[PDB]
Amino acid sequence: LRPFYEESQSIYDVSDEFFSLFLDPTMAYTCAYFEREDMTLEEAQNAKFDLALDKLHLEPGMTLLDIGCGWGGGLQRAIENYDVNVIGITLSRNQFEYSKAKLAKIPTERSVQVRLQGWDEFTDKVDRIVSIGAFEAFKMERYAAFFERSYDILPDDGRMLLHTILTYTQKQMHEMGVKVTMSDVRFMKFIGEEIQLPAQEDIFKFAQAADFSVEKVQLLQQHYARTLNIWAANLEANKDRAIALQSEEIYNKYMHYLTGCEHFFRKGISNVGQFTLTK
Numbered sequence: 001l002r003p004f005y006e007e008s009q010s011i012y013d014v015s016d017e018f019f020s021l022f023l024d025p026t027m028a029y030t031c032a033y034f035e036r037e038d039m040t041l042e043e044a045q046n047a048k049f050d051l052a053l054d055k056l057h058l059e060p061g062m063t064l065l066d067i068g069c070g071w072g073g074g075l076q077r078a079i080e081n082y083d084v085n086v087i088g089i090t091l092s093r094n095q096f097e098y099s100k101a102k103l104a105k106i107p108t109e110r111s112v113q114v115r116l117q118g119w120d121e122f123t124d125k126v127d128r129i130v131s132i133g134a135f136e137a138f139k140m141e142r143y144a145a146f147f148e149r150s151y152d153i154l155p156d157d158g159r160m161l162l163h164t165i166l167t168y169t170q171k172q173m174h175e176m177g178v179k180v181t182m183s184d185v186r187f188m189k190f191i192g193e194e195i196q197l198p199a200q201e202d203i204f205k206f207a208q209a210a211d212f213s214v215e216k217v218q219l220l221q222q223h224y225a226r227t228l229n230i231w232a233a234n235l236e237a238n239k240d241r242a243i244a245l246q247s248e249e250i251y252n253k254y255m256h257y258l259t260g261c262e263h264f265f266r267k268g269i270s271n272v273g274q275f276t277l278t279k
């Protein structure tokens with residue numbers, strides 16, 4: 001704690017325009033799914049959203065909730081590909097306004113709602129839930145309430161797709177032969193300052209405590225390494241504009257974050273899973 005207040009430059013202070021320098025046009029900010037090896041980033045992001053949505057067994061007329069909708073790409077796929085009502089919620093005002101404006105332009109015969117709202121305040125009954133990349137922003141003290149609230153707002157036949165990043169235990173790493181180095185440790189400290197993760201077993205434990213069953217987990221480890229690689233290449237290609245919009249310090253922090261995380265997935269320290277939860 002510094003005695004004098006300092007309005008500093010944070011990676012969280014950048015505009016939508018900055019993110020458009022390296023995200024694909026749909027502005028997905030989570031692991032893509034290279035269902036075909038030759039897919040572009042945009043095609044793999046659409047394929048990731050389709051992968052999650054397909055696991056929900058959506059039927060015409062249902063209501064889908066996207067917990068943590070970001071810049072709206074998941075809800076666009078849902079509106080375009082299913083005859084369903086949608087609700088998207090986010091804690092980001094920029095993402096809220098962006099998703100609202102994006103989805104307002106999409107023809108639809110169903111209801112569409114975008115809200116600046118946390119899951120802890122959400123009580124609407126919905127038929128299915130998708131949540132991609134939101135869980136890693138939750139504190140572990142709130143995990144149980146999250147799964148309990150998710151269970152409660154679903155019907156008897158309800159299904160939830162939970163997509164989130166994962167870590168391994170030391171024993172599993174020693175088993176798998178993953179050696180964590182000092183530079184890895186220093187990067188984890190960089191994360192704790194600028195930005196602990198659950199293991200796959202933790203997700204099973206918490207979902208089951210809320211009376212969900214885990215029907216499926218699908219791991220996308222190397223898809224994330226490739227997703228982060230492309231993001232980093234795009235940002236580097238747009239370096240001059242990133243520095244003009246922000247600064248070399250902000251550019252460097254993002255580049256360090258993207259390429260460090262890429263290394264963690266490539267090396268096998270981290271993973272990312274889609275959990276199909278049923279009721």
Ligand SMILES: Nc1ncnc2c1ncn2[C@@H]1O[C@H](CSCC[C@H](N)C(=O)O)[C@@H](O)[C@H]1O
Pocket residue numbers: 027028029030067068069070071074089090091092095117118119120131132133134137138
């Ligand atoms: N407690 C909470 N309740 C609701 N949304 C939350 C939340 N904590 C984080 N979020 C939202 O979760 C999102 C994480 S970013 C992932 C965005 C999108 N699903 C994608 O795949 O690109 C952001 O929109 C963030 O505002």
Ligand SMILES: [Cl-]
Pocket residue numbers: 013014015016017018245246
């Ligand atoms: Cl900016």
